[PDB]
């Protein structure tokens, strides 16, 4: 009967209708109610006496700035409550304590600055909690102590500076934790104590100066991210206490030296990307890790590749080793899953026919800016399909044609002293080619 809409399955929606108070005249048996995008400033004492059977209540974007402590009384069956984008300057401690059956509580997008000590007390059934985009200055340790059953907590976009010891000690059931976009500088030794069930930990965009030693207390981690930070070293065995790690985000940092065995015994890691780790000399001792699909090391001083690379990493697909000082190449046989190989800007000085032998599913090969001096005739014969092949800026006197009939895009720019010309009878599928000397393309 209200000016807003309705639904057959005991649901009422009144979003964006410009209401100033809760709508009256609705059915007593209402299971869901939406009042999100109306302009309501306060909830009186007797607001929700007419809806004893509410299960979901939405108030996002109401510009709500006051909640009477008795407003939510009587909603024993409430399960979902959203209050984001309002002007609640603090967590409504008194108002929400009567919600025994509450399971989801959204309070993000507010201007929360203080959390009373007795907040969230009595919320036995709470399982999800949002506190993003607030002006919080420290972790509410004691208010969180009253939520042993929490399963997902997020405190992003706040102004957190440091996390004290035993901050989340009683949240043994937590499995998701977000802390990105904060100003966190230091993590105490036992800050994450008791988070034995945590599965994802987000620490992006913070100001960490040293690697967090606390993550050694997390035995069930699966996803970890600390990019956009100021971390410079991953000393050694940092992930020793996280055997189940799968994804690591560390690709935007002033990384200078990652440990030789930093990534070691991580049997479930998928992607490993390290950029700008200049001081690294040896190859990462990534024994045990045999589930890699992408391996990217750039900007380092690696002088050699180990022969056992993909006879161990049989699942490897992308192998980027640009920059660095790779002088010799180990035989890539056993690299059956390699789709892309990148070796540009290296010290590679020759490609003997036994180097790229045995690769089948190769798709792209990059050898630009190297010092390749010679290639044996049959070096390219053994590989299967090829779509890209760059040997720009090397000292190639001659370039073989056998095995490149399937070639699509070819780039020899700057290969001066490559006098003797190619021919279209072997190179048949090309429609992209750039050659040193001049008018080498009069045949094509």
């Amino acid at each position: 009967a209200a000016p807003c809409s309705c639904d057959g399955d005991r649901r009422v929606d009144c979003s964006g209708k410009g209401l100033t108070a809760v709508p009256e005249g609705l059915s007593a048996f209402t299971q869901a109610l939406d009042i999100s995008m109306n302009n309501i400033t306060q909830l009186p004492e007797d607001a929700f006496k007419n809806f004893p059977f509410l299960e979901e209540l939405q108030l996002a974007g109401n510009d709500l700035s006051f909640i009477h402590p008795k407003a939510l009384s009587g909603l024993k069956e409430l399960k979902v409550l959203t209050l984001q984008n309002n002007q609640l300057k603090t967590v409504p401690s008194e108002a929400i304590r009567g919600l025994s059956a509450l399971q989801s509580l959204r309070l993000d997008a507010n201007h929360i600055t203080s959390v009373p000590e007795d907040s969230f007390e009595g919320l036995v059934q709470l399982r999800h909690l949002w506190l993003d985009d607030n002006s919080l200055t420290e972790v509410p340790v004691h208010p969180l102590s009253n939520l042993p059953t929490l399963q997902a907590l997020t405190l992003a976009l706040n102004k957190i500076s440091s996390i004290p010891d035993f901050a989340f000690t009683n949240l043994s059931s937590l499995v998701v934790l977000h802390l990105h976009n904060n100003k966190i500088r230091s993590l105490s030794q036992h800050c994450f104590d008791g988070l034995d069930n945590l599965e994802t930990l987000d620490l992006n965009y913070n100001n960490l100066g040293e690697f967090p030693q606390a993550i050694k207390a997390l035995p069930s981690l699966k996803e970890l991210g600390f990019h956009s930070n100021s971390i410079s070293v991953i000393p050694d065995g940092a992930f020793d206490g996280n055997p189940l790690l799968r994804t690591i985000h560390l690709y935007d940092n002033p990384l200078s030296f990652v440990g030789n065995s930093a990534f070691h015994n991580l049997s479930d890691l998928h992607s490993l990307v390290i950029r700008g780790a200049s001081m690294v000399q040896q190859f990462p001792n990534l024994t045990g890790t045999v589930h890699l699909e992408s391996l990217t090391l750039t900007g380092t001083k690696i002088s050699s590749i180990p022969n056992n690379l993909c006879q161990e990493q049989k699942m490897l697909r992308t192998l980027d080793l640009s920059y660095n000082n790779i002088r010799d190449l180990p035989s890539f046989n056993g690299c059956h899953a390699l789709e892309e190989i990148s070796l540009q800007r290296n010290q590679i000085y020759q490609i003997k026919e036994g180097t790229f032998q045995g690769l089948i599913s190769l798709r792209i090969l990059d050898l630009s800016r190297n010092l390749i001096h010679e290639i044996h005739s049959r070096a390219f014969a053994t590989l299967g399909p090829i779509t890209n092949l760059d040997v720009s800026f090397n000292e190639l006197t001659s370039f073989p044609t056998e095995g490149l009939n399937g070639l699509n895009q070819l780039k020899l720019v700057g290969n001066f002293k490559l006098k003797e010309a190619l021919a279209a009878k072997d190179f048949v599928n090309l429609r992209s080619l750039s050659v040193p000397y001049a008018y080498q393309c009069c045949a094509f």
Partner: nanobody
């Protein structure tokens, strides 16, 4: 103006943990005016630091708030609020109080 903003608690007499005065401009949020706890400790707002004064008569639960030389900004509706249990720190936070009054109007002109 010698404006005495009295209050009265009718429920129970034994000293509640905390009692504050708050004010509300039309349509905006509730921001605090003053607070007093069981020990007699007192807190005021920055705009209220000197003009007003919160008092109390514990034996009778008549809790006054004295205002003099009211600024023209001081037009609002004032609420007397209380709390019983001790599980929080006293302060000018509207979310900790348990009982709220119907408030009254104070319109300062000139």
């Amino acid at each position: 103006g010698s404006l005495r903003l009295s209050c009265a608690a009718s429920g129970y007499t034994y000293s509640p943990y905390c009692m504050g005065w708050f004010r509300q401009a039309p349509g905006k949020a509730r921001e605090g005016v003053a607070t007093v706890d069981l020990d007699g400790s007192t807190i005021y707002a920055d705009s209220v630091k000197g003009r007003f004064t919160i008092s109390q008569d514990n034996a009778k639960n008549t809790l006054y708030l004295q205002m003099n030389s009211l600024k023209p900004e001081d037009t609002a509706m004032y609420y007397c609020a209380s709390r019983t249990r001790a599980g929080v720190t006293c302060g000018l936070n509207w979310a900790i109080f348990s009982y709220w009054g119907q408030g009254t109007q104070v319109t300062v002109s000139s």
